[PDB]
Symmetry: D2
Subunit: 419 residues, 4 copies
Amino acid sequence: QQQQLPAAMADTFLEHLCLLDIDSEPVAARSTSIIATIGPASRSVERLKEMIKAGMNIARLNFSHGSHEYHAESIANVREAVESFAGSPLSYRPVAIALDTKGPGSGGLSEQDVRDLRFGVEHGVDIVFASFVRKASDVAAVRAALGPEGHGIKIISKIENHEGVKRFDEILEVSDGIMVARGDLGIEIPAEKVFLAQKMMIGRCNLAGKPVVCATQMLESMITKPRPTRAETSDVANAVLDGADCIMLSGETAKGNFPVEAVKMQHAIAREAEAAVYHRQLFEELRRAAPLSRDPTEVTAIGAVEAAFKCCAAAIIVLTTTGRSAQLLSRYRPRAAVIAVTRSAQAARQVHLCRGVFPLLYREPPEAIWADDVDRRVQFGIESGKLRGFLRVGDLVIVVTGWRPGSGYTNIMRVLSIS
Amino acid sequence: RADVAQLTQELGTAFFQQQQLPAAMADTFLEHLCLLDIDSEPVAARSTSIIATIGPASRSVERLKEMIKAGMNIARLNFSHGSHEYHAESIANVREAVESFAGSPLSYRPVAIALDTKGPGSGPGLSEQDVRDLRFGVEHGVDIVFASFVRKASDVAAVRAALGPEGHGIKIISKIENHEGVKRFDEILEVSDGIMVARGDLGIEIPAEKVFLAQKMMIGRCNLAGKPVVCATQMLESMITKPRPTRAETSDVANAVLDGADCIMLSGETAKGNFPVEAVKMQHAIAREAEAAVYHRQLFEELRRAAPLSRDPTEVTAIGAVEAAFKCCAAAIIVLTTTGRSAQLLSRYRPRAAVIAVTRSAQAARQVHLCRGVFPLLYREPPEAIWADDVDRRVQFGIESGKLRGFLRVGDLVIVVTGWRPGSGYTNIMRVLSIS
Amino acid sequence: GTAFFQQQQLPAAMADTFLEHLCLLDIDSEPVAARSTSIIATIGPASRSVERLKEMIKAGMNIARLNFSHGSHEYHAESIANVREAVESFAGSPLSYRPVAIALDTKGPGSGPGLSEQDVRDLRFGVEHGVDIVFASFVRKASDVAAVRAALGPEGHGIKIISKIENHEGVKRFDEILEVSDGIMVARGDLGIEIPAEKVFLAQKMMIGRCNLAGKPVVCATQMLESMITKPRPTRAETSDVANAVLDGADCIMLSGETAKGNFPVEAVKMQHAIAREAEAAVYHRQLFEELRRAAPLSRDPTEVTAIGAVEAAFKCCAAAIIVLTTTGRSAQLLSRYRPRAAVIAVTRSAQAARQVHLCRGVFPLLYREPPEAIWADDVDRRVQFGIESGKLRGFLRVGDLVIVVTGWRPGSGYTNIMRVLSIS
Amino acid sequence: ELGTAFFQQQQLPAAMADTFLEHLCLLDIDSEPVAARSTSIIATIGPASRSVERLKEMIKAGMNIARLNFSHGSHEYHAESIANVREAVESFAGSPLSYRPVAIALDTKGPPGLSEQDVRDLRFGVEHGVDIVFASFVRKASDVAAVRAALGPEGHGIKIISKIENHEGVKRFDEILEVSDGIMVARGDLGIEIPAEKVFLAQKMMIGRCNLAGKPVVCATQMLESMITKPRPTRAETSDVANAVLDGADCIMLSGETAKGNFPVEAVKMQHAIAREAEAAVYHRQLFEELRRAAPLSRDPTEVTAIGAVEAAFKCCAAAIIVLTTTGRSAQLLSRYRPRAAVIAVTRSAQAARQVHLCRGVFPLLYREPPEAIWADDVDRRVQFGIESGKLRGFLRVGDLVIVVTGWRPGSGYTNIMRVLSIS
Ligand SMILES: O=C(O)C[C@H](NC(=O)[C@@H]1CCCN(S(=O)(=O)c2cc3c(c(O)c2O)C(=O)c2ccccc2C3=O)C1)C(=O)O
Ligand SMILES: O=C(O)C[C@H](NC(=O)[C@@H]1CCCN(S(=O)(=O)c2cc3c(c(O)c2O)C(=O)c2ccccc2C3=O)C1)C(=O)O
Ligand SMILES: O=P(O)(O)OC[C@H]1O[C@](O)(COP(=O)(O)O)[C@@H](O)[C@@H]1O
Ligand SMILES: O=P(O)(O)OC[C@H]1O[C@](O)(COP(=O)(O)O)[C@@H](O)[C@@H]1O
Ligand SMILES: O=P(O)(O)OC[C@H]1O[C@](O)(COP(=O)(O)O)[C@@H](O)[C@@H]1O
Ligand SMILES: O=P(O)(O)OC[C@H]1O[C@](O)(COP(=O)(O)O)[C@@H](O)[C@@H]1O
Ligand SMILES: O=C([O-])C(=O)[O-]
Ligand SMILES: O=C([O-])C(=O)[O-]
Ligand SMILES: O=C([O-])C(=O)[O-]
Ligand SMILES: O=C([O-])C(=O)[O-]
Ligand SMILES: [K+]
Ligand SMILES: [K+]
Ligand SMILES: [K+]
Ligand SMILES: [K+]
Ligand SMILES: [Mg+2]
Ligand SMILES: [Mg+2]
Ligand SMILES: [Mg+2]
Ligand SMILES: [Mg+2]
């Protein structure tokens, strides 16, 4: 069987490793998002279209380099390349725009960061990767600089030094997610300890149900060479096996000679690594560690993920306004793809931060009766699923909806047979 | 502590001290035993059904009303004794006592009627007396048949044939009473609705010191198959003459419930003993204590690992509903069911939450007592013009009855299990509702 | 051979879950191992004759309980003499001799706060007559155990004190009582009157689990085979109660009226023996050993470190037995706490230790009577050979079996530190 | 007692966790490694690492096995490299605290059958007393039988580590492992023969199967590749070394990093530093439980004693397991259970001392004293030699507990005793 299913049925982690097979082909869609840094090698609209097709989900703008005019042109080219595929709504792929700050240098929040954060809000960025976060008040300062119009922007705190690692719990508590920024971390702490910080932060983010990004030098040699080293493919695979929600490309896409090939390589590795995850242990541990809850979205999410594993569901289709119901399903790491149907273009972009969430932006005319409108969004999730290869006739899907309009009311799970 | 800290702040430390919840959160079975507490009071309604044999000591309508109030769920008629006229009178008295509570539909308790056959004796097949007794059962509308000395699958096919076309709905519980029945258990279970571990004859047919092995094996296999299993005979034997049982008898009842039995039975204790009502009360009190002492964490994990993957939406919905109920400490799972099957599939996962089964079928309401933790509510209202409105009314009946009976309080979370179209076999929906 | 793997519930033993272990239990899978749960029989008019006592020792009685709630000191001194005469009648065959402990069960405190004056006199009688164990009635707190220990005086330091938990206070103060006691008795008779009868199983399971965690003996007592006081065969609930006490983890099971005053004393001992043997094979060792290991704290005591290594080695090779040399019984007790499937054959020169180790599940005491060899290593080896020859005569061992041998580096108690894998020749 | 400081080091809070997820959450960059580095480092000897002075620095940095790649150079060139390795190793014989055996491994050029060049290179290996052969492109069991036959009448004690470098070797892995002494995951060729994105699956599978079989497994190629020209490795390279150790590799290897790069000693130091951190991060609670469950029951006393000794070592946090071995087999059977305690192997065989570097956590001590007339006295002198070397090296202190593994009679194959000793 395909997708490492013989290894998935093993009774121990050791026997699971023994049953991994190079001939067992991945079938599921790639779950881990790829963040590509936009720079001179990846700015053109033509190049960006190839990167979107290769698998890029989030475009990162590094505000340590370039100018506001330079980054505004990069953003416009990304949006032009993304919108060139809007003519086919059943296959359109949203792409998030993330702003990576310069940081505080030797100083609180720098004056350049205040200006760059204002630029981000004015240009409608979806995410901020806040550099050198060392305490909870650093996150509050970034949040205040985003102003009242930036309330919806996700703040991903970059842990880059000893203090950020030691104050991790307080930083995670007030952040939307974390970035393990291994470049600076490997200079701030002994290089041989970075893997411990990475594994600990990934484990704690998985426990909290918050996104974690593994970043820097994942495919470094691909800046000048067409193929990566054996250590680089292993590093990407191990970040996915560790539990990372996203993987990142920096120089490989910003300035390298093979930007599209680097995206394709991360895509190919992530797909193979996701099938090699030992879900039997992972799901059991995530389920046991997740606290008891009286929030109906939290209760519906665990019931839906348990139902999906019971029937080998091809997908969990969820309606979401903010992305929260999809995120609560994602935290249990289902093998079934989480297809998130939303009308919010921003939520569709932001939900790429959560592993295994495939956003579908709903642009069909509204139905007069709310129950009919919900049913047509579910049929849209199914038709997009069929066109993209997620679903076939005869598959079982789990459908997650709410009892009334508006965010916060998810409380229903349904088992549906396709066609 | 982090996995229960926010819910402990919300529900309070008193909530988490009751119903053996500190033992329930233990990481190993050994730690679970160490945390069992005689001061941790049971809160949940008693989920293991009590089968009481009706005889001279428990035949009067007034006595039967006391037995229904004490906890009797199934009335057993032993066709090894008495006559058809005698058993017909016992059935009529049971129905009169049961119907005396029908005036309040929100609190009415259905009681099943089970016929226990005499058996084949030295003969190889279905005896002539069994054919007549089975015909009597169909004519008197019995809900269940406890078939004596089942030794192979063809014995149950013979009982099924003798029930005729009008007895298709009657549940057949095969009694395993000898070495052959134990050895051919898998084939017998496959064609039966459930099993009875008939320890009286089993303890004479096989060495007495081996009966506990047969009991534990059959209970484990029935739990794995999701089929009811009854533990029977000499559970509270000394209560035939004494008002209080021995230490071995209370332990035996508690251990049958901990083994996984769906029902426990009283024979001479209710049929001829001096303390029939007290015997029912004692089984009720022990079963409530033992149900709270079940280590659900291991049981649910093992039922998931052992159960094969399923593409039946009723089965997929049932595991999702039970998982959701454990996540929020749901007070109940309300399920709409025509035949009892959706309630049975929830029951096989052994939820701690009560399974309140709302049905229009009076027979299904009586028969679901065979499944652990299923509380039947008989809905008597005529159908609404719009099917979705009729579904909603039945769910509200379950909620309002749940509040009236003490199962539910304002602020509780309940899991609601329904289907997408009318008729049996279409359960596919799970909803989380907050009680207001 | 394939026959080996069909016996002693070995298909159920290899199951991956407790549920599948239950599903694989087989009434045709015969027990092979020797019965490991000790039987305590209460002495009375039905079991006091020397000839009847010989039959009870052959049926499996390991501990004789003297109930000091009945009879004078003169009655109990005769009971002691008769027990010793019956036990010593088998001393002429040292390879088959079975030690039998004598336990004194006190009358209790009554309406008083703690140690009654009658208990002080009974305890002094126990020391003067050399009893091995005291079952202290109605223990409610740690100071009750200290009072029993003080009443035993300086000459009774070696006597084991088993605290009987018989009321709500003893259950609530269980941890402090267990800490100062050598073991516990779940006295279900009084417990079932002091607390609601439907809660006794919770107290029994909790106390057995905590004693197993602590590595201290626990006795399940009262009305286990009650109907056998007058009837030749027990009820279905009684056989199930005995089997479930063994499956719960009890080290000993007890008979009271069944052996003291009933008409079937020998048959009651035989019935407990037959049930315990079937129940011990049905224990799911895979989960039990895993949980005992995880719960047991780290240790720097070499006896404890050797014991866990020896039990792990025994499971790896399906050892027929673990033979241990012991002066006080402590090395055998530390092996027993890990619940090996292999029998723990304890070879000792101490007649008292040989009697007292019956409190520990799976310990088979052998009393070595030969004078010491001049070379200490030769004395150790002769004792190990005595364990092997006793084991072969009694059916524990055959040629070709593997056995784990546990010894120490110097004479005297407290120095066990060696484990060795030995092939039986 | 041990103190609270003891329980804060070597990731002991993460070691006590009840789940793998909790274990990851408790990993701490401030919890310092204390145990000696247990994963062996294989360094390829070439132009950048051939001189006696350079080899002395590589031995001090942590090199345990010297690899000679017969795909390059000549017999004369490799004979000079072997002589320089032996000269550098023997320069530390004057101090027990610095002397360390170093194995010599011959890596063949590769292949219808065994090539003429491989036959001659294998003969060169036997004549020069190599300890190990890394056999290139092993595709089936008969390839290993051909290498074994070419090792001739004198080289039957040489360990054959089969290099799995293509699709066929991966598919016929079980039959190859059965007849080999160990495996090398040769990722360079493997990443060209199969899709590059599948190499991690083959690596994890082969490591898991070798751990299950109790046979050494080497992770090789491009582990610290950028260190050929740069003084510090990339983030992906440090992670790759740490993950090979966490996967269960017995050895890690350096190729161009030591053979031709500008920083050979620094590459060895980097592998040493990462392996030490990664070994403390292994979740022993699950690993030991799974190795125990997957391993079949055994009636071999060495195997039964090994599991009892490893269980005893975990129970008391033993500083070391001292084992007397002539062939290395008793040390290998302890190593397969992955104890946290160091396995100090006392042997009179210089070849067994070099070869046990293939087994994770085995620290060989070569013993050269003349045999005592009373065998029990000869055994006691070797046990005390292991203890005094352990005290001198920092493994042991007075008051520590050690597990000692011996047999009941002389000769290899009789290990059946485990003892708990308090260090005095
Ligand atoms: O302290 C510093 O000076 C910088 C520091 N380190 C680095 O950025 C690394 C070293 C430099 C190269 N990069 S890179 O290749 O990933 C990279 C390069 C570029 C851009 C990036 O975003 C980017 O990540 C631009 O955006 C851009 C824009 C306009 C012109 C050129 C460029 C460009 O070359 C890695 C940091 O980010 O804090
Ligand atoms: O498929 C092949 O072509 C054969 C294959 N080679 C490679 O692919 C490797 C990758 C490129 C570089 N390395 S290297 O830097 O590690 C390497 C280089 C050299 C030596 C090595 O051992 C060695 O591994 C010498 O021993 C030596 C001796 C004398 C002169 C020069 C040298 C020398 O340069 C070799 C193999 O050896 O398996
Ligand atoms: O994931 P979120 O943000 O809570 O959104 C979930 C919400 O989406 C719905 O399914 C559909 O709501 P809308 O019709 O307003 O889009 C609600 O019933 C539910 O509360
Ligand atoms: O448990 P059963 O027998 O399958 O009945 C479940 C059925 O009950 C319902 O919830 C309601 O059906 P009715 O309206 O026919 O009573 C169905 O949607 C579902 O299929
Ligand atoms: O179990 P205990 O009382 O600690 O006795 C174990 C002792 O028995 C021995 O094996 C034999 O000692 P003796 O020769 O004194 O009987 C000692 O080596 C060991 O210390
Ligand atoms: O690991 P190996 O090669 O089997 O060697 C273990 C052998 O070493 C010993 O401990 C000591 O043997 P020698 O005195 O011959 O060295 C033997 O008793 C045991 O059989
Ligand atoms: O800023 C970053 O991404 C880093 O340092 O790794
Ligand atoms: O028939 C019965 O119920 C029995 O034998 O137990
Ligand atoms: O004293 C006892 O043995 C009792 O009360 O059970
Ligand atoms: O030969 C090797 O070492 C390789 O291919 O990795
Ligand atoms: K930046
Ligand atoms: K009958
Ligand atoms: K008494
Ligand atoms: K080579
Ligand atoms: Mg940085
Ligand atoms: Mg019968
Ligand atoms: Mg009493
Ligand atoms: Mg190669």
